[PDB]
Design an enzyme around this catalytic site. Structure first.
Site, short mmCIF file in Angstrom:
data_model
loop_
_atom_site.label_atom_id
_atom_site.label_comp_id
_atom_site.label_asym_id
_atom_site.label_seq_id
_atom_site.Cartn_x
_atom_site.Cartn_y
_atom_site.Cartn_z
N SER A 163 0.83 -1.17 0.00
CA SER A 163 0.00 0.00 0.00
C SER A 163 0.87 1.24 0.00
O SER A 163 2.01 1.21 0.47
CB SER A 163 -0.95 0.02 1.21
OG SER A 163 -0.32 0.58 2.35
N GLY A 164 0.33 2.32 -0.52
CA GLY A 164 1.11 3.55 -0.64
C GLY A 164 0.39 4.57 -1.47
O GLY A 164 -0.85 4.57 -1.53
N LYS A 187 -6.20 -4.17 -6.93
CA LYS A 187 -5.77 -2.84 -6.53
C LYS A 187 -6.96 -1.89 -6.30
O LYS A 187 -7.81 -1.70 -7.18
CB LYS A 187 -4.80 -2.27 -7.57
CG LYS A 187 -4.35 -0.86 -7.32
CD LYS A 187 -3.70 -0.29 -8.56
CE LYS A 187 -2.53 0.60 -8.19
NZ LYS A 187 -1.76 1.10 -9.38
N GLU A 246 -2.60 -8.66 -13.80
CA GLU A 246 -1.88 -9.94 -13.77
C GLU A 246 -0.89 -9.99 -12.62
O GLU A 246 -0.36 -8.95 -12.20
CB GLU A 246 -1.19 -10.27 -15.11
CG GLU A 246 -0.63 -9.10 -15.86
CD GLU A 246 0.20 -9.48 -17.08
OE1 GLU A 246 1.08 -8.68 -17.46
OE2 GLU A 246 -0.02 -10.56 -17.67
N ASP A 266 6.84 8.04 -13.59
CA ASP A 266 7.29 7.64 -12.26
C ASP A 266 8.12 6.35 -12.31
O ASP A 266 7.93 5.44 -11.50
CB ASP A 266 6.08 7.49 -11.32
CG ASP A 266 6.46 7.56 -9.83
OD1 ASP A 266 7.55 8.10 -9.50
OD2 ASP A 266 5.66 7.09 -9.01
O1 LWG Z 1 -0.02 -2.06 -9.72
C1 LWG Z 1 0.57 -2.30 -8.67
N1 LWG Z 1 0.91 -1.38 -7.72
C2 LWG Z 1 1.56 -1.70 -6.55
N2 LWG Z 1 1.96 -2.87 -6.16
C3 LWG Z 1 1.64 -3.87 -7.08
C4 LWG Z 1 0.99 -3.57 -8.25
S1 LWG Z 1 0.74 -4.97 -9.19
C5 LWG Z 1 1.51 -5.96 -8.02
C6 LWG Z 1 1.67 -7.32 -8.15
CL1 LWG Z 1 1.08 -8.08 -9.59
C7 LWG Z 1 2.31 -7.98 -7.13
C8 LWG Z 1 2.76 -7.29 -6.02
C9 LWG Z 1 2.59 -5.92 -5.90
CL2 LWG Z 1 3.13 -5.00 -4.52
C10 LWG Z 1 1.95 -5.24 -6.92
#
Ligand code: LWG
EC number: 2.7.11.1
Length: 274
Positions: free
Chosen positions: A14-15, A35, A89, A135
């Site tokens: 998260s962020g 998400k 994905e 970014d």
């Molecule tokens: O779009 C993202 N934003 C932030 N983190 C992630 C995504 S996809 C994704 C996947 Cl597939 C696996 C693990 C993370 Cl932490 C994130």
């Protein structure tokens, strides 16, 4: 429709991007990331080829989703009263590059080369699709640890690519070019190349070169780790203070440091231990 379609697992992160959960498509057991983005935390809105009020992030992901595996692809999205939910994905196993660099320190040049090359291909794909990421950084790159493949994530700060000046920015300041810092003005491609120089330095040195505005504006690069002269030159070229003195994507990929890159699977077998 509705989240009877997905089983939800652990929070993955998260962020600034929202909250991302591990997920499984019930339909076929496809691994997915789920998400959540709050509506009030969305500033940039677009509309679809259809023509509905969606976050720019959805517009941008739709434009880059398809054959290429350099970007984490948007599989579906849902609107909720207070939020949007995006299904993406999920490679397995996966680690983000920030964590990979945290765990392993400065990367060997052979590995940084393969990683940097794949990032360049991914960013070229976005630009070809008319999408500016804005970014690019280690936190926004995932490593498919078994395939040796890197994937771009969080397009939440990005924009449609254009040939005129950008006067807005909400990406990561320490990866932002001196022209943004000084004038609040940048062009998309040369700004992207600057961010790529920061990322490259980050890979071969184990940290970013600049922390403060005055460091960015000065543009003086100090190498804290042993790095070949070819790599230093490419980095110094990407970090040129004048936007027009920076290399094009073609110039970067034709640079001598970039020659004879490892295939992704070669990369996983050698460096990620497949
Ligand atoms: O779009 C993202 N934003 C932030 N983190 C992630 C995504 S996809 C994704 C996947 Cl597939 C696996 C693990 C993370 Cl932490 C994130």
């Amino acid at each position: 429709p509705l989240e009877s379609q997905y089983q939800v697992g652990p929070l993955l992160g998260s962020g600034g991007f929202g909250s991302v959960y591990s997920g499984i498509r019930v339909s076929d057991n496809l691994p997915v990331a789920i998400k959540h983005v709050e509506k009030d935390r969305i500033s940039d809105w677009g509309e679809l080829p259809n023509g509905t009020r969606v976050p720019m992030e959805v517009v941008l992901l739709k434009k880059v989703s398809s054959g290429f595996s350099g970007v984490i692809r948007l599989l579906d999205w849902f609107e909720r009263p207070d939020s949007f939910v995006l299904i993406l994905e999920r490679p397995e196993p996966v680690q983000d590059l920030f964590d990979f660099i945290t765990e392993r320190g400065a990367l060997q040049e052979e590995l940084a080369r393969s990683f940097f090359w794949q990032v360049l291909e991914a960013v070229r794909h976005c630009h070809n699709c008319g999408v500016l990421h804005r970014d690019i950084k280690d936190e926004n790159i995932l490593i498919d640890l078994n395939r040796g493949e890197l994937k771009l994530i969080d397009f939440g700060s990005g924009a449609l690519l254009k040939d005129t000046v950008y006067t807005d920015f909400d990406g990561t300041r320490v990866y932002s070019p001196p022209e943004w810092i000084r004038y609040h003005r940048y062009h998309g491609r040369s700004a992207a190349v600057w961010s790529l120089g920061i990322l490259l330095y980050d890979m071969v040195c184990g940290d970013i070169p600049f922390e403060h505005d005055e460091e960015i504006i000065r543009g003086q690069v100090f190498f804290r780790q042993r790095v070949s002269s070819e790599c230093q030159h490419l980095i110094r070229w990407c970090l040129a203070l004048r936007p027009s003195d920076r290399p094009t994507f073609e110039e970067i990929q034709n640079h001598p440091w970039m020659q004879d890159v490892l295939l992704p699977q070669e990369t996983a077998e050698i460096h990620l231990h497949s």
